[PDB]
Amino acid sequence: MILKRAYDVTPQKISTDKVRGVRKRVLIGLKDAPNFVMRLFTVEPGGLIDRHSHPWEHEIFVLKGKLTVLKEQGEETVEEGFYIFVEPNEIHGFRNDTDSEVEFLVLIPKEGGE
């Protein structure tokens, strides 16, 4: 059994053509998990995960702040205490328009989970 403070997992900064101002923690990876993985994303003020899609779903829980969710068209803001279910293949992305860090949990099946 693994019991750990998520913050203590070292985050990985991401800065690419599609993702900026984001870091990622792998909490439960496929080293441990047989079916699905658990990650925690932190999005700095102005950070962006641009629209994309996958062959797999996302299950998300918003832990902190106000998260802007990019949809195929348009966008919707949600806050801490929301969950999000992204069907396979659905276009999605994220932005933080606020002045503080936004955090959300993201779980994906193992095929996405490397």
Interaction of residue 106 with a second copy, rule CB under 8 A: no
Residue of 46, 52, 76, 100 that binds a second copy (CB under 8 A): 76
Residue of 34, 74, 99, 114 that binds a second copy (CB under 8 A): 34
Closest to 6 measured CA to CA, from 69, 48, 61: 61
* Whether 110 contacts 37, CB under 8 Å: yes
Interaction of residue 105 with a second copy, rule CB under 8 A: yes
Euclidean distance between CA atoms 109 and 112, whole angstroms = 6
Interaction of residue 35 with a second copy, rule CB under 8 A: yes
Give the contacts of 97 (CB within 8 A, at least 6 positions apart).
46, 66, 68, 77
**Using CB under 8 A as the criterion, which residues of the chain lie in contact with a second copy when the complex forms?**
1-7, 27-28, 32-36, 38, 56-57, 59, 61, 63, 69, 71, 76, 78, 81-90, 92, 105, 107, 109
